[PDB]
Every structure is written in C-alpha cells, then in structure tokens.
Amino acid sequence: SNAAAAAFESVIEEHDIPGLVVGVTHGGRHSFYQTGLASREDQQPVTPDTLFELGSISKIFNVTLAALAEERGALSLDAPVADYLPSLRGSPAGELTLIDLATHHTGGLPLQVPDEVADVDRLVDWLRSWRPPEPGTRSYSNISIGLLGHITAGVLGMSYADASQTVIFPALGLKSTWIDVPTDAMGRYAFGYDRKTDAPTRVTPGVLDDEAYGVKSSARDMLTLLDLELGTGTASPEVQTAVATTQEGRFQTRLYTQAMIWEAYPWPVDPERLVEGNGYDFILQPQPVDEVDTTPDRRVILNKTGSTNGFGGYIAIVPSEDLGVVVLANRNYPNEARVRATYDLITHILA
C-alpha cells in the first residue's frame, strides 16, 4: 500500500515538487497517495479533493463532449470544419474533418495560438489563409483541439464553459471538475509553483483556453473519469459509447496509435518508447502517420500528459488490467519523469 510513495520519492526531490497526489483505480477499488502542500504560504495540504490545473488533459473532456455530441446527432466527427465554420469553405483548414482536429491530423500548426491573434473570430480568419507545410502529418497543437471545442459548443447552443459544466461533467458524474471554479471551491484550488522563480502561479487567460486547457479537477474526480474510461463506471449508453469512440485507433505514428487526444501504446511496452513518444522532439514537430482503424495489438496502454506553467499531470489506463492511474502535481516537471515513475508504479501494482 506504499508503492506510489516509493515510485515518486525521487522525482519529488529532483524537482522540489511542493505537492503531489496519485489516485489509483484497480478493479473498481480507489486508492490515493498524497504528500506535501497545495499552498506553501498557508500550509494547506494536498488531499484527494485538492483541485489541480489539468492542462492538455482537459482535451480529454473536449473530445468526449464531441463524441457525446455525435451520439446525439448534433454533429458528425467525419464532417469537414467548413460545415460549421462556413467562412472556411474551400480552404485547407475548412477541409479538415472534426476527427482531424481531435487527432492533430492537420499538416502542421504552431503549438500555441499566435500572439497576434486577439480572439477566436480573428483565429478563424487566420486559419483561412493558413497552409499546412506538411499535409497529412500529425502536428500537436492547441489551435486545432481548441477549434473543435468551439465547434462542439456552437452546435450545442452554449458557451464551451456551459457545455463542460452543464453537459459533459454531469454526464460523467463529476462533482469537483470546473472550467470556472466557484467561490465555495476556491479554497481547494492548489497554487502552482513556477520552475524558474519558485513563485506561486495560476493559469492565465488566452484564446481558446477554456476549450484547450482550462479544466481544473481533483484526484478523486479523475478516478471517476478513469473508471468510465476503463469501461467500469456508471453512465448512460450515450456516454459509454462516447468514451469508447475517443479511444478508437485513428492514425498510426512511428511510436503509438493516435486516438482522439488519447495516445495508445501496446501493452506491455518498453518504457523508453513511452518516454520518446512523450518527448519534445516528437511533440513539437510534424510527424508522418499511417491511417488505420485500430491499434496493432489488442492489449494497449493509453496515456495523456497535461501541464500548465505551475502544474504537471499525467493519466494512464490499461483496460485489460482494469487499471487506471492519475498523477497531479503543482510543479511542472518533465514528461519523462512522469512516465517512468508512473510506469514503475504500474509494474509494482501488477507484480
């Protein structure tokens, strides 16, 4: 019952992680390991109910909502973007499909919304004259996943915030997951700690922030989400189907199978392949992909990193083992460290 402490003891000291939580779900049984402070100043400890910034892990909720919108007939994940942003008809961006957005299959975009773009309408104009340098390649970007959330919310008739908080979060059974944290919950909201200055920090506003990286959640709520991703949760047939839609293999990269935001590796894996697949050389440049309808192996591990300036997160699920792990820290620390420590914890659990 002490496996998570041993697995993360090294990274906590190598990167001075002020607070960290590890939730594990295995055969439906939830366990948590908590250590350190959510806030240094008032010495609030981390608990399973401390809220952390999820960063890119927010994109999981995004694609689930798009899949749930498809289950309801509000959109089709195969339609072109131009069906929903009609000023983009005839342009390369308007001929991307919603699936292309969910899988980064765009041919090359900057990771961040350009500094010069002031809002989402201006971003749509910017996309109209964008030309992918390497058509057909995978290119990890907030721009494309953010646009999909904007499209989905538009099809539902409400802000992406209201789509998250009144549609997908309740459908998933979550009670401590927010785009906008309410007054009664702000005391639970951890401070982040900047890598360089060690100064307290919190995500700052930005174009498509809600849609791409604006979710805050707790370890306890994330285990509820992972039980649903493992197929062993309580949800309507809609949501069970939407969850499964987001894990289907869509494209094959050199190192893993790209699903909707989920990235799926064979199980068992060489952890070095998990490290490289989550390394910057792979993340920040276009990669060639082969189209395919499934993963090469029928036993897989699916993972997702997520960071803000002050936070470092990671989730992994092994469905053939009914195993799910979430690791949330209020220090942004390297992807390689999250992978190796989580892979170490998983091997101990299954030993």
Vertex 46, ends 44 and 52: CA angle to 5°?
105
Q: How was this structure determined?
A: X-ray
> Which among 33, 84, 140, 333 is annotated as catalytic?
140
Tell me phi and psi for residue 154, to 5 degrees. -60, -40
DSSP strand pairing (300-307 vs 312-318): antiparallel
Give me the resolution in angstroms, 1 decimal. 2.2
HEC states along 79-102? Answer: CEHHHCCHHHCCCHHHHCEHHHHH
* DSSP H stretches of helix in 174-292: 209-213, 219-229, 237-247, 271-277, 280-283
Q: Give Cβ neighbours of residue 295 (< 8 Å, ≥ 6 apart).
A: 249, 257, 264, 266
Vertex 54, ends 49 and 57: CA angle to 5°?
125
Answer whether 150's CB lies under 8 Å from 159's CB: no
Identify whether 265 is a catalytic site residue: no
Answer whether 167's CB lies under 8 Å from 65's CB: yes
Q: Give Cβ neighbours of residue 182 (< 8 Å, ≥ 6 apart).
A: none
Identify whether 140 is a catalytic site residue: yes
> Which among 33, 39, 56, 164 is annotated as catalytic?
56
Distance CA 237, CA 243 (A): 10
- Domain-wise residue ranges, the chain: 1-351
